[PDB]
Amino acid sequence: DLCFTNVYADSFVIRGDEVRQIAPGQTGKIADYNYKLPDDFTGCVIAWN
Amino acid sequence: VFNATRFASVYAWNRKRISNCVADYSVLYNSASFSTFKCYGVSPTKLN
Numbered sequence: 894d895l896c897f898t899n900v901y902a903d904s905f906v907i908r909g910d911e912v913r914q915i916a917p918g919q920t921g922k923i924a925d926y927n928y929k930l931p932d933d934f935t936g937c938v939i940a941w942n
Numbered sequence: 943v944f945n946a947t948r949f950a951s952v953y954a955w956n957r958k959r960i961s962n963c964v965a966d967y968s969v970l971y972n973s974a975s976f977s978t979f980k981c982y983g984v985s986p987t988k989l990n
Contacts, residue, residue, distance in 0.1 A: 920986055922974065 903928075912940045944975075966990070 905928065907915075914921035917934040924930065930938075943958050950956035967990040970976060979986060 925971075 909942075915940075 907923065907928075911921075911923050913919075914923040915928070915930060915938055917930050917932050919930070930936075943960070970979070971987075981989070
């Protein structure tokens with residue numbers, strides 16, 4: 894329904910238990926070191942096995 | 943407290959008093975130890 898101008902998709906792979914740490918405001922060896930979402934982040938987090 | 947061999951039973955638990963010392967919480971993030979670590983009242987990273 895609502896559409897956007899620029900769409901950026903960051904593709905990568907992580908360990909199974911590390912998907913819970915991807916989200917705004919999360920803390921951990923993921924958000925802190927390798928990959929981090931802004932606290933104001935607006936988007937969709939996707940994962941599959 | 944954390945590294946003790948056997949803790950007290952949850953039925954009767956032992957409350958350890960930590961006072962007059964230096965609490966270094968940076969070792970937790972430098973060397974991964976806790977599997978589940980969360981803070982309800984305060985921030986996990988600001989404890990130091």
